[PDB]
Write a protein that binds this ligand. Sequence first.
Ligand SMILES: [Zn+2]
Length: 184
Amino acid sequence: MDPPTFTFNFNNEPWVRGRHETYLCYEVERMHNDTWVLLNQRRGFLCNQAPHKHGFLEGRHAELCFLDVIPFWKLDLDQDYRVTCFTSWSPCFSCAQEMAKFISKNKHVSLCIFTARIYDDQGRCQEGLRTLAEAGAKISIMTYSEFKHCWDTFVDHQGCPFQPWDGLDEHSQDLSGRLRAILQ
Ligand SMILES: [Zn+2]
């Protein structure tokens, strides 16, 4: 992922101004049946698929595209895995139920979703996040740590260390208060 795209998409300044896409970075770690440790399996990122006459007519949300690729990972079906997602926006109502379905029918997948801004359409989105948590997914807001991790792991930084934008911590704190209230 190029630096301008990351910084533009994962900036946590409340404004819904220009950010019409949803980027999603994921990491997969095998549980390990004996010890306490996790094993690196794979990683990657993706974004939504805008409506297109030569593709998904009704559009393809990043969350749906993410679930589309898991089959291609070919994880041993009788093993436990940790799946972590860093998303620029939180899932819509429809994608939340879809992810909640996945983790409910699998059991061998621990899903942790870290989001930069919360997409709350003020309607059913809040309910969707409660459904995902009910399903056992960890839903949390990205802080300095998650932003830096993604920068170091998923960005072509070309050696440049991560440089936090002003207010990152502030917006991160506020969003955390809103999410905690949404859930409970
Ligand atoms: Zn969606």
